[PDB]
Amino acid sequence: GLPLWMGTFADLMSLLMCFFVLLLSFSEMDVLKFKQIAGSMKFAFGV
Amino acid sequence: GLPLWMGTFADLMSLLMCFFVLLLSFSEMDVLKFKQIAGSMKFAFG
Amino acid sequence: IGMFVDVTSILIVVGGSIFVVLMKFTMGQFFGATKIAGKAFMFKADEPEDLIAKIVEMADAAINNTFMQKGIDLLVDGHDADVVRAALKKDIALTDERHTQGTGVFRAFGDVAPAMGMIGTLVGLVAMLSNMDDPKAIGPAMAVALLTTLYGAILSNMVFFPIADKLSLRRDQETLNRRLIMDGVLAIQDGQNPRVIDSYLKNYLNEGKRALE
Amino acid sequence: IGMFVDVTSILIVVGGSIFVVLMKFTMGQFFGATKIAGKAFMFKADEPEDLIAKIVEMADAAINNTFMQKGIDLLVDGHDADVVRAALKKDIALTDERHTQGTGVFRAFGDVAPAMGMIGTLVGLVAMLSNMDDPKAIGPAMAVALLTTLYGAILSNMVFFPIADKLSLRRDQETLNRRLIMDGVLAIQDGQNPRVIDSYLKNYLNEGKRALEI
Amino acid sequence: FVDVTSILIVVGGSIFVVLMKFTMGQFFGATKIAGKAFMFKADEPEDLIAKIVEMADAAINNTFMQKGIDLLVDGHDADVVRAALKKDIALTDERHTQGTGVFRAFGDVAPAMGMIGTLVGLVAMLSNMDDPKAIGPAMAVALLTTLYGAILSNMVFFPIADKLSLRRDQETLNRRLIMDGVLAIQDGQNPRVIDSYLKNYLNEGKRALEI
Amino acid sequence: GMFVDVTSILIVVGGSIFVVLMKFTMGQFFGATKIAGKAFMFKADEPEDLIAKIVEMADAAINNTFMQKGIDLLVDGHDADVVRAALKKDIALTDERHTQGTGVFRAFGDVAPAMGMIGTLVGLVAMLSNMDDPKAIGPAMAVALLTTLYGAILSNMVFFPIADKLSLRRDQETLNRRLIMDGVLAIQDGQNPRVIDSYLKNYLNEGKRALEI
Amino acid sequence: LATLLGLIGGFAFVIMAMVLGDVTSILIVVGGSIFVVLMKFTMGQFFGATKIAGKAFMFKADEPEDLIAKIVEMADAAINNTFMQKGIDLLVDGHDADVVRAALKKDIALTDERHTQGTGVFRAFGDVAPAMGMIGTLVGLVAMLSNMDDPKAIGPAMAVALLTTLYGAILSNMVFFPIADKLSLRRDQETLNRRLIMDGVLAIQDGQNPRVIDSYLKNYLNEGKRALEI
Ligand code: NA
Ligand code: NA
């Protein structure tokens, strides 16, 4: 079976993700930052 | 042990956390809303 | 609100764990497990070395321990070997049974605590996400979720599982001590040499976890 | 209130759990398990100490428990000791197997509920992601996914598994009560005094789970 | 949602791993036994008991019962027919257990391939970030992989394995009842006592609830 | 570009290798690799072919290492005890070797997803710590995602299927060696070809092969 | 290829170590793990397990081939190894075969129990480390949320709390569990060596033929995990 602490790990991961959803609920998108992120991720994945 | 659905849940949850961190990396947060949220958290936690 | 969140989280975790466990064990069973845990935590087990010394002391002549007192009472009543051996084995099995049931009760608590933590986290997260436009509600919901997860983890890993492990360790120690008393009483009834039985009982001192030399 | 109620989510969880469980249990077996749970929850088992007093109460003379009712009925009809022993042991085995099957049904339900919660939260996440141009109004969309997961967790941990655990506890209480009546019924047929049986009837009263009480 | 590529990925990965575990002939046999357990119905024990009682009164549709009768007619002792029937029962039990194992293996391998497919889709999307508005919907199709695996791991493969195990238990009960009837027939025992003995098998390890 | 791929491969593969080398020595790992390579590029001898060969020698009285050992041991050792003991010893050696190889690959497949999770956590920590450098979060997400993907692929598509194939090869080799041992015993006892041919029929449809019939 | 595997394993361990090191985050994990572990094992038992692990990691076990060579040397005749010297002294002082067998079996069982206890202690540590890392992460999250002042600090501080969780994993899968596995391997190696020594001592005392006992020793060498190396 799974480790006994995997339930708490899923709990923590969900808690963190929902905190990030809350943070994004009042966020504002930036286009230049998005372009920089896209370029960096293209560089990272060898494209 | 624990049922494997818990492991699938944990993997999916960590995946979603990673992508949401990516989303918020290039997002700008409102400062007034952030101050309100911080005050609410501070009052809730003591 | 600040104390309301703590009260709600403690209620969720502890009340859910208690409700789930009481459907598995009777309230008398739960109180017996609590009593045996308190006994194993507030009392030190008798050293097998002192038991060996006392046993060879009475063997040379041929009593704070209750099992030893019962064995001596059985021996002094002129009973045959089979009856006394069966009675001592029955007492050993009874003690093993109580300790195993207490370990099971606290293990049940241990696996139920994180489930209640997960349930409270899901409740708090749903309340936060639905009430996004009300800042006064996202705070207490986040606090309830985080604190219920933290309380579940702390109770499962630092309270209930270590208590179950301590109960199992005390069960092993009590089983070893009672087996030592049984062997000493059987040797006294047989009337063997004190040195031979002393060596045979000292052979027990390297059994299991006692390998700390 | 309305944030914890969703028709589609509860539909997914309950329909999936029922559909998967019916792949192993017919509808009649499921209804028998539900009847078992209702009997075990709405009724309490007779006290074993109260059973012993009642058995010896009718011994010198020579009624609420149906098992002892059957026992005294066969005693009045005067069957042999073998017939009574076989009938009572068959009834005991039937009750034990029936309770075990009810426990298995509810354990299967509790095992399959959180898997359907995971499936429903995956569906909700897909629905949320197909409609997110910007991450602003995704709170109430994640609400329904976490709601399906919450339904699965609550049903598994606080409804189905406790019922399966209560059914195991009832079986142990029933088994002890069944054995006490069987031994008591045999004593009446033999013709023994009320006091001799009481010496050995209470020897194994604290058996298994009950060992913690003493 | 519906995506041919995602279901193809999940099915192909699960098939590849199972073909690493079992062989193609074993997989086909498991599919055949699952189809026979689904589209057909096992004979009720009551009908079997009635047929054996009728045969005892006079002294045939089930293949096991036909084999038992054919072994009984040609002057064969109890030991040989008992051994043959036990061998047939063991073979049927082994076939059903193997089918259960194949479908269980499919069940535990489906969600891993769902996760692998969704991760591959995520990497492919992150390596081609062009429009922000298409970042959200993208995981949808990627997540369509994982969901499928979960569904296949909880609504198809594991239910089929459980149905196969239930059919295995039912066939074991029916064949044991037929064997007991045959052993009673060769003994020439009275119809009423053997009827009672066979009805004593009605409250088996799963039928007690319906009583 | 290369840095993040090399870092993910480092984390996953190197962690798996380090843990397994802690478990198994390098020579044992190379033996397991040899066993897997032999089981992947060499079809197991068909049992029907073995039965045909056995009845061919039985009627009269190569191309198989166990058969060569059997004939060489029969041509000198007249007693059946030594030959049976040697054949059983070889069977047990092959079974143990295949079991050890399966254990090695199962250990690899168990440890890989742990390294994937560790890499995900490392990438998450880096991404959260920077959160303002575009050139720093691209590599971090690459590391996290690629560690998870590599762990899943290695555990579910490489190591576990290799262990399962090794188990299948162990079963096939055990059945073939049992058939050869039974044929050697029959040719020692001078049994009729027909009775042994019928006696190996239940040997044929054993376990996995029962589905084909 | 052995050098390549050793180098890649060492490099993975090194990069995980520099990821580990930072001082407080590991301190919480180790303190919680120690506190929970000491409810099952005393302080003396914990130090005994640590000593056993250190001995197994620093020192190397004697090769069974050298043991066979020494055994056959003494068998044909009629030692730095402690167990071999003890057996030689026991058989040369004058005793029955049963006494020597009992003493050697008692020592073998003692070593087996010691290594099993060490393995159990380190497996308990590996089981309890991730939970304590997670608890530290949750405490850090609570502190961060109750001291929430700057959005720019939401990211980094979060990464600090999650750091604790990472350490737990890095300690569970790469320190404690490998140590327990190495302890099990050392237990198997020492059990094989001591069984070989006992068989050789019995053969020398009983005056058995050197060839048959040598073949017996090879048969002993050709089993266990050692089968993969042949
Ligand atoms: Na992503
Ligand atoms: Na990931």
Curated annotation (Swiss-Prot), chain D:
Any one Gene Ontology cellular component term annotated for this protein: plasma membrane
Subcellular location: Cell inner membrane
Pfam family, one: MotA_ExbB
InterPro entries named among the record's database cross-references: Flag_MotA_CS, MotA-like, MotA_ExbB_proton_chnl
GO biological process: bacterial-type flagellum-dependent swarming motility; chemotaxis; proton transmembrane transport
Membrane-topology annotation of the record: Multi-pass membrane protein
Disulfide bridge map: none
Recorded superkingdom: Bacteria
Topology feature Cytoplasmic, residues: 164-214
Function, as annotated: PomA and PomB comprise the stator element of the flagellar motor complex. Required for rotation of the flagellar motor. Probable transmembrane proton channel.
PANTHER family, sorted: CHEMOTAXIS PROTEIN MOTA (PTHR30433), MOTILITY PROTEIN A (PTHR30433:SF2)
Similarity remark: Belongs to the MotA family.
Binding partners and assembly: Each stator complex is composed of 4 PomA and 2 PomB subunits. 2 A subunits and 1 B subunit are thought to form a single ion channel, so that each stator complex contains two channels.
Protein name as annotated: Chemotaxis protein PomA
Taxonomic path: Bacteria, Pseudomonadati, Pseudomonadota, Gammaproteobacteria, Vibrionales
From Swiss-Prot, chain G:
Gene Ontology BP term (one): chemotaxis
Highest taxon of source: Bacteria
Transmembrane segments: 4-21, 22-39, 125-145, 159-179
Keyword Membrane: yes
Membrane protein topology class: Multi-pass membrane protein
GO cellular component: plasma membrane
Intervals, Cytoplasmic compartment: 180-230
Annotated keywords: Cell inner membrane, Cell membrane, Chemotaxis, Flagellar rotation, Hydrogen ion transport, Ion transport, Membrane, Transmembrane, Transmembrane helix, Transport
Subcellular location: Cell inner membrane
Role of this protein: PomA and PomB comprise the stator element of the flagellar motor complex. Required for rotation of the flagellar motor. Probable transmembrane proton channel.
Subunit organization: Each stator complex is composed of 4 PomA and 2 PomB subunits. 2 A subunits and 1 B subunit are thought to form a single ion channel, so that each stator complex contains two channels.
Family of this protein: Belongs to the MotA family.
NCBIfam families for this protein: PRK08990.1
Name assigned to this protein: Chemotaxis protein PomA
Organism: Vibrio alginolyticus
